[PDB]
């Protein structure tokens, strides 16, 4: 397979569990840091980055009733300036720019608690599919599926449901979804990081998933494999690796990665593109810091990118 060794630039440090990368509708870079504690106790924290030099600020350092939240993975609503993050206690968070946030479902659409969430990916239609491999939110005892298999997938519609659409998974981490040239989505793709698999599934509308299938291989037996992911434009699929210092790249088809991305660090943990730009951001968590390079082509627009208003 072969291998490029682009230039990568350090944008900021000291971020306890590094991941999240994610741009808002002006542009502001933000990432979270699940691992930041307190007293050996969940303290993590969403912060932005301002680009220019580098430095951070934590705007939200979410908890409810006491729990504090482990801030995983973020999308950038469209209608609005605001975030949805994925949170291994507090399950899925809406946090606004003011650093205010709202806890969105303490149980899904079949009065099931709601598990622990760790990233999730907006398709055009305003869906947001998210990936859960924590078990159930505070107030409940923290558990992971990294041994066990009862990570689940879930679909926040935009009407409002928090429906469970697959259960089973041992530890379902990355997601992403891929969308006909019209903008019809119709794949989801998620990764299940120790089984070094990414499961396709053809959406058939929303909150509704069928034909699940082995669609990649991550390459590698060493402790980790497929976290974070997006698409460029070209739909190509790019993944971070974790623990084989490499990012993924899969052709349309999926199968075995075409390319791989070398990088100076072993845990690449997620990435995401500058809108308009072929820079992506690097989480890792060998330095718990973030890193940009520049890819081959620009990133296929988030739904935050994509205008609700438009003719075209
Ligand atoms: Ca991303």
Known sequence: ??????????????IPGAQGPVFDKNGDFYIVAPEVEVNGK????????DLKTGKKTVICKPE???????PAGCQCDRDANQLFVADMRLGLLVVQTDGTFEEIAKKDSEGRRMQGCDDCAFDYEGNLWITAPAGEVAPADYTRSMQEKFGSIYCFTTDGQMIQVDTAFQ??????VRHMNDGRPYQLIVAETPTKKLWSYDIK????????KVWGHIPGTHEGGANGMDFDEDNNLLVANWGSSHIEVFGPDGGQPKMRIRCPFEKPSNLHFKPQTKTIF???????????????????????????????
């Open 1 to 14: 397979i072969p291998v490029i060794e682009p230039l990568f630039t350090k944008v900021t440090e000291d």
């Open 42 to 49: 969940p303290a993590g924290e969403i912060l932005r980055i």
């Open 64 to 70: 409810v009733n006491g729990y504090g939240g482990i």
């Open 171 to 176: 530890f379902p981490d990355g997601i992403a």
């Open 205 to 212: 509308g929303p909150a509704k998933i069928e034909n699940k």
């Open 282 to 312: 690097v989480t890792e968590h060998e330095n718990n810091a973030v890193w940009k390079f520049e890819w081959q082509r620009n990133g296929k627009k988030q739904y935050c990118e994509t205008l609700k208003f438009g003719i075209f």
